[PDB]
Amino acid sequence: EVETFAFQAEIAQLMSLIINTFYSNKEIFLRELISNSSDALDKIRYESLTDPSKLDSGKELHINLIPNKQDRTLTIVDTGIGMTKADLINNLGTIAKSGTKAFMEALQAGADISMIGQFGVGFYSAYLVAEKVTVITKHNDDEQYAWESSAGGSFTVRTDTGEPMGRGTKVILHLKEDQTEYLEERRIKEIVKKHSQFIGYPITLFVE
Amino acid sequence: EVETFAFQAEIAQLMSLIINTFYSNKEIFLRELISNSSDALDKIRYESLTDPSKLDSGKELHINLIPNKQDRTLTIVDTGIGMTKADLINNLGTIAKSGTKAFMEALQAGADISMIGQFGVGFYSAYLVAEKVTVITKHNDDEQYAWESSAGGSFTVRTDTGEPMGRGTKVILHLKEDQTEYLEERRIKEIVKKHSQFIGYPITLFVE
Numbered sequence: 001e002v003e004t005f006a007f008q009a010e011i012a013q014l015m016s017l018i019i020n021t022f023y024s025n026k027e028i029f030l031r032e033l034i035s036n037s038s039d040a041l042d043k044i045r046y047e048s049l050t051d052p053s054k055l056d057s058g059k060e061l062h063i064n065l066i067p068n069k070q071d072r073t074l075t076i077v078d079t080g081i082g083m084t085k086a087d088l089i090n091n092l093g094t095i096a097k098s099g100t101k102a103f104m105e106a107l108q109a110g111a112d113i114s115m116i117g118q119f120g121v122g123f124y125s126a127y128l129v130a131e132k133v134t135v136i137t138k139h140n141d142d143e144q145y146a147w148e149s150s151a152g153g154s155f156t157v158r159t160d161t162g163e164p165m166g167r168g169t170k171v172i173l174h175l176k177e178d179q180t181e182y183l184e185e186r187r188i189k190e191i192v193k194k195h196s197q198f199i200g201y202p203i204t205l206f207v208e
Numbered sequence: 209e210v211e212t213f214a215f216q217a218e219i220a221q222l223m224s225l226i227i228n229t230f231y232s233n234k235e236i237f238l239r240e241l242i243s244n245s246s247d248a249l250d251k252i253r254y255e256s257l258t259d260p261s262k263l264d265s266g267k268e269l270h271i272n273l274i275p276n277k278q279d280r281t282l283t284i285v286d287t288g289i290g291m292t293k294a295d296l297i298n299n300l301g302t303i304a305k306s307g308t309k310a311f312m313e314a315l316q317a318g319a320d321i322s323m324i325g326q327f328g329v330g331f332y333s334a335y336l337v338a339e340k341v342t343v344i345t346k347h348n349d350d351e352q353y354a355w356e357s358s359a360g361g362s363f364t365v366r367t368d369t370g371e372p373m374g375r376g377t378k379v380i381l382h383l384k385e386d387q388t389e390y391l392e393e394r395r396i397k398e399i400v401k402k403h404s405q406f407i408g409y410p411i412t413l414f415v416e
């Protein structure tokens with residue numbers, strides 16, 4: 001059923017640093033995740049140029065932001081390329097061992113955490129606001145998996161027996177009890193206007 | 209021998225706009241190309257995690273900047289993943305039809321040309337300083353090709369019968385007669401310090 005994995009030592013370190021370093025500009029987490037979704041959307045778009053049957057699983061390419069105040073979650077859904085099980089396990093598709101090394105070396109050279117996505121490890125900036133991230137993903141090659149962590153050096157992967165999604169990745173952020181501002185419609189609008197105003201796919205902010 | 213292709217109408221338009229729009233901050237072209245090389249280097253690195261024989265063609269991952277004042281060229285060499293012939297033809301691996309659409313829509317909404325790489329069409333910013341770009345590339349799956357354009361709505365692809373390179377892509381910029389500043393060691397250093405100081409692969413500026 002549930003398989004448990006250890007983060008590579010470097011990714012464990014990165015995460016600890018994101019959770020432990022005092023850093024007020026937490027909002028950048030949404031830019032990082034939107035831009036991840038935008039990159040995955042490019043990949044399914046590039047691939048459908050040569051093989052247009054890859055879109056049999058969803059012809060519409062978009063990003064949705066779903067806050068839910070009861071569950072204290074913000075969900076970023078994209079209909080991008082999705083991850084195989086192998087991708088999930090290899091640090092959600094990233095070059096995370098050397099991306100972290102490069103990042104922790106930019107840090108001790110005049111850079112701040114906001115430059116995280118330049119090293120290809122943006123996803124972990126989710127840990128700025130979330131106490132637990134759950135990642136549901138579906139690639140055309142493979143079945144649907146749920147990936148999950150509350151940091152602490154381990155993550156779980158299970159085949160997700162719940163709701164089919166067709167193709168893409170849903171990042172569910174279970175927010176820290178003091179970061180509920182990121183559930184407010186006004187707050188989300190502002191961040192999307194400020195950090196992601198020129199992203200080439202519809203972004204849709206759901207209402208409650 | 210030499211096959212000639214037509215740029216897609218949108219890419220033709222983008223290029224014309226890059227060549228024709230008055231825009232003084234031409235230097236951003238080097239940031240765009242370095243960051244393309246860095247992305248390709250990530251791809252061969254991600255792929256060698258699962259299959260370490262993909263590095264049989266070059267174990268070292270780096271970017272080199274080679275000015276040559278006699279030929280009036282600046283060459284950006286990377287040992288990244290390389291392009292197949294198909295990739296070369298599909299707009300050098302980019303989503304260029306819709307990336308341009310997204311870009312030309314950011315333009316008439318408060319954005320300037322420097323935001324070009326956010327739409328995945330950074331490569332064409334080469335036309336800010338070059339009268340002709342020649343692209344030599346080698347992917348592990350395929351042979352070695354030269355791709356070439358002086359804009360005007362057409363590009364050529366030939367199998368490159370010259371010097372083997374092992375794996376990667378070399379972008380040769382044949383500079384406009386008034387943009388030779390980009391051949392100066394001081395000028396290149398400054399741009400690399402200002403726009404690309406935290407890129408996670410060695411960048412080496414060759415000397416003449």
Ligand SMILES: CCC(=O)c1ccc(O)cc1O
Nearest residue numbers: 036037040080082083093169
């Ligand atoms: C591999 C690309 C992918 O599916 C993905 C990864 C991280 C993320 O925050 C969003 C995504 O869509």
Ligand SMILES: CCC(=O)c1ccc(O)cc1O
Nearest residue numbers: 244245248288290291301377
């Ligand atoms: C497909 C990635 C690739 O080989 C490449 C493309 C454009 C570029 O300026 C440099 C590159 O290395």
